[PDB]
Structure 1
Amino acid sequence: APTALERVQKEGVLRVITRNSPATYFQDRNGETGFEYELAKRFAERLGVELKIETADNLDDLYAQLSREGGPALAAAGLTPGREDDASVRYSHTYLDVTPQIIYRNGQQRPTRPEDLVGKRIMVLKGSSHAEQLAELKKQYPELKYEESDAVEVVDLLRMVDVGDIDLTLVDSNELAMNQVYFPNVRVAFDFGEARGLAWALPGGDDDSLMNEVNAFLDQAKKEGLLQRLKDRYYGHVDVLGYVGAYTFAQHLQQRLPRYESHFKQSGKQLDTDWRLLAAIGYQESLWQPGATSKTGVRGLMMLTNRTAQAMGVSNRLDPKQSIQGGSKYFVQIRSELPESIKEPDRSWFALAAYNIGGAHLEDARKMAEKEGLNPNKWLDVKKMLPRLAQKQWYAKTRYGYARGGETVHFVQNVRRYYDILTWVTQP
């Protein structure tokens, strides 16, 4: 009989079951994203087969699907292995360490120890490792009460805390970090238990043909830095923006963006460009404040110079609609003017750089990249060269000389993150 691996390669498809969530697998008109999605995609390519994603509405369903005849090959869904073996499931090597965290609402008193969880309105996901943590705690503290939901995602639990529907939830640290940017009142109470490793799940039994390939792959994904890069993209908001930066973004998302969203959407439509990228530029530039000023000659929501404003037909840089229109028009123009050899998505990152530093200085960075034997059409290569424009050792011999290329790298990295964050917004 064919092995699990032989079946996948025979069918030419790897079926992977996950959850429908930005953290794992997420559909947007532009495409598909997610930590587990990207990892599974790379694994499918390693096997030389197509990736077919399936989703489950809760963990019980996910595990039921995995154990059914004709079920998927594996589950990739930020799964924490149970503390005892069950014949129905086998786990891969772990690929990410996460810390369970009790989450509370700023404005209420912070529980500091497990004992403080008694007398609280608590909700967690049914079938989760977090539910088992509370079940175990309840044996020690019988008065402990908590509820389990089998019909929501982690984003929904955190929303419940944020708006005061519940007092506390318990989630993995990476999910908190990913969602802190949406919920301004959510705070970590304390770390509950030691760090746990996430793992992919495979069906039960003695067939190790696919498992050995999974573990070989995860080892390689770690070595090549893939796991780190994915971790930083999806789960790195607090690491990069800072904790205060993250919940402050949440506040601004809630209070400021609604005043200007319609403008960004209108500009995006008439310019045929993703409005969330425009909004992301707006946040990096002014934190969505149309009255924002500077001492460097830029002003307004999109931080336009007088020269750019004039060129774009902006008569009032302090008018949010005008600033958004002009700034968006300028970004699209810049992007259109880039050398044809620069393809999307890199093309958009180059355009962000040019928005910040100008096309002339950017071209110097591209020429430096080529000279160093790097690809001048790949953003990640040119990004290495930009900071050198700030150092006389390098810029003195460039055509256009000194430029703050370090700030440009920061600008693009931040805008790309804000862009991700806005794309991953989900509705209540």
Structure 2
Amino acid sequence: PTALERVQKEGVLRVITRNSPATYFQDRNGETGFEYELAKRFAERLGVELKIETADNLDDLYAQLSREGGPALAAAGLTPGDDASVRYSHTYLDVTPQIIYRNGQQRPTRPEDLVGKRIMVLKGSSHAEQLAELKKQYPELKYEESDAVEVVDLLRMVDVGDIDLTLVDSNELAMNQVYFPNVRVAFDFGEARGLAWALPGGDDDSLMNEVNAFLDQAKKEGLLQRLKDRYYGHVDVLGYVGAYTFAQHLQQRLPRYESHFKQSGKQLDTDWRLLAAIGYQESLWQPGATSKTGVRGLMMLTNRTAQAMGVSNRLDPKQSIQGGSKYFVQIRSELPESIKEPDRSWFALAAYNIGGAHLEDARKMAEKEGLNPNKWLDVKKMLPRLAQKQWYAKTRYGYARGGETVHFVQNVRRYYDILTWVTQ
């Protein structure tokens, strides 16, 4: 039976990956990861179940792949390795290895500067191999390979000054930037290269052909780009300053209010990280925060909402978290029965910012356009229109800043993702 026929026969596609939020992550809310979502799509294309294995490290990852009866493929942000014990699919993401340093230290600008530093990379990585190449040229270059850490750990070490430098791909630095406020790109070390899935060595090309056809379909429909934005887009969407500032706020601000968020979350069957995400978007986790628009405190409440909720002080963190949390749940509960989770929460987020009246208008508008008013992706196309006259003059409630409401829901969902992917 071909590699491809065997997968169909078993009704399972076995995938091996790295223990990493970038690749595969287990949370109470389900499974996420750039590679997980991409592979899950592959399995479903083939009409089979996805079964995920995580390796201990990169050497063990490649060793399992060549192992008889092992996984069909590795999906793990791999950079192509002549070792015909392993083969590689077409590439699916353009990334750049980048030398990483700690802000407030001498920035190395060229490979020469890598000499005489404390450097660590993952044992078995293409990054390790790059440094072996440079060592050939510069015989006194020192660095260490480790099989007992992952990429998140290498960046922590640079962040707190445990080591001077590391070397990682630019996608994963972007992803991690929101955890490590001091980490910065020293320079791009080596040129841009594509990530590839790896398959066992040999001449059976039945599954490889399907992987390539699938990845090429993925680039046709923007799937790879959507997945990139979600996991790797943090610095691009929130801006550089937003990225490292969040890392700082996560470190400095959140631990003061984490326990209130959890307590509000438990008593309301609502994920506390979703509540924390709203607090970040509203006030950047600052209890004293006031606007000059009639909203104040950590969850940014109006006086009216504060009183309805039993809040006697909006600048009290605990009370602001409780009232804004109850309020979000209230809004979400009042939504029409027809809106199912997960959309229901994203609708509730929009209503938190714009109110149910304008949100109704966006729902009515989607309906007028032959879209589905209970689907978030549909209504989200309608929200920016509330700010345009050809549209809002035809609405009950008129002009609203719906583009801002879109921004609100995206950011919160991103902050939510970020808080979910935290490791310790």
TM-score band, normalised by shorter chain: over 0.9
Q: Deviations over 1:215-268 (max 9, x none)?
A: 000011111111010000000000001111100000000000000000000000
Give the equivalent residue in structure 2 for 1:210. 207
SS of 2:132 mapped into structure 1: helix
Give the equivalent residue in structure 2 for 1:9. 8
Match status 1:247 vs 2:241: no
Q: Deviations over 1:56-83 (max 9, x none)?
A: 011100000000111110000000002x
Number of paired residues? 424
CA distance in 1, matches of 2:352, 2:169: 37
Give the CA deviation at 1:378: 1.0
Give the CA deviation at 1:210: 0.2
CA distance in 2, matches of 1:400, 1:309: 24
Work out which of the residue numbers 217, 222, 227 in structure 2 matches 1:225.
Answer: 222
Q: Deviations over 1:141-185 (max 9, x none)?
A: 111000011011100000000011100000000010000000011
Further displaced range: 372-381 or 9-18: 372-381
CA distance in 2, matches of 1:381, 1:307: 31
Q: Deviations over 1:279-327 (max 9, x none)?
A: 0000000000010011111111000011111111111111110000000
Give the CA deviation at 1:375: 1.0
CA distance in 1, matches of 2:20, 2:374: 32
SS of 1:253 mapped into structure 2: helix
CA distance in 2, matches of 1:331, 1:151: 42
CA distance in 2, matches of 1:340, 1:410: 25
SS of 2:257 mapped into structure 1: helix
CA distance in 1, matches of 2:390, 2:309: 36
Give the CA deviation at 1:14: 0.2
SS of 2:178 mapped into structure 1: coil
Q: After TM superposition, list the pairs within 5 Å mapping 1:12-23 onto structure 2.
A: 12-23=11-22
SS of 1:383 mapped into structure 2: helix
CA distance in 2, matches of 1:146, 1:20: 23
SS of 1:314 mapped into structure 2: coil
Give the CA deviation at 1:354: 0.2
SS of 1:187 mapped into structure 2: strand
CA RMSD of the aligned region, Å?
Answer: 0.6
Work out which of the residue numbers 372, 375, 388 in structure 1 matches 2:372.
Answer: 375
Give the equivalent residue in structure 2 for 1:64. 63
Give the equivalent residue in structure 1 for 2:326. 329
Give the CA deviation at 1:11: 0.5
CA distance in 2, matches of 1:400, 1:248: 37
Give the equivalent residue in structure 2 for 1:308. 305
Q: Deviations over 1:18-68 (max 9, x none)?
A: 011110000001100000000000000000100000110111000000001
CA distance in 1, matches of 2:338, 2:226: 26
Give the CA deviation at 1:418: 0.2
Q: Deviations over 1:84-108 (max 9, x none)?
A: x211011000000100000001111
CA distance in 2, matches of 1:344, 1:219: 31
CA distance in 2, matches of 1:234, 1:43: 18
Give the CA deviation at 1:396: 1.6
Give the CA deviation at 1:377: 1.0
Identity level (%): 100
SS of 2:94 mapped into structure 1: strand
SS of 1:190 mapped into structure 2: strand
CA distance in 1, matches of 2:307, 2:381: 33
Q: TM-score, normalization: structure 1?
A: 0.98
Give the CA deviation at 1:341: 1.1
SS of 1:108 mapped into structure 2: coil
CA distance in 1, matches of 2:108, 2:337: 57
SS of 1:277 mapped into structure 2: helix
Further displaced range: 126-135 or 386-395: 386-395
Match status 1:105 vs 2:116: no
Q: Deviations over 1:384-420 (max 9, x none)?
A: 1101111222112201111110110000000000000
SS of 2:14 mapped into structure 1: strand
CA distance in 2, matches of 1:72, 1:345: 32
Runs of 4+ residues over 4 Å off in structure 1: none
CA distance in 1, matches of 2:316, 2:390: 42
Match status 1:78 vs 2:77: yes
SS of 2:31 mapped into structure 1: strand
SS of 1:318 mapped into structure 2: coil
Q: TM-score, normalization: structure 2?
A: 0.99
CA distance in 2, matches of 1:214, 1:388: 40
CA distance in 1, matches of 2:336, 2:39: 34
CA distance in 2, matches of 1:307, 1:356: 15
CA distance in 2, matches of 1:149, 1:248: 30
Further displaced range: 307-316 or 351-360: 307-316
SS of 1:242 mapped into structure 2: helix
Give the CA deviation at 1:345: 0.8
SS of 1:401 mapped into structure 2: coil
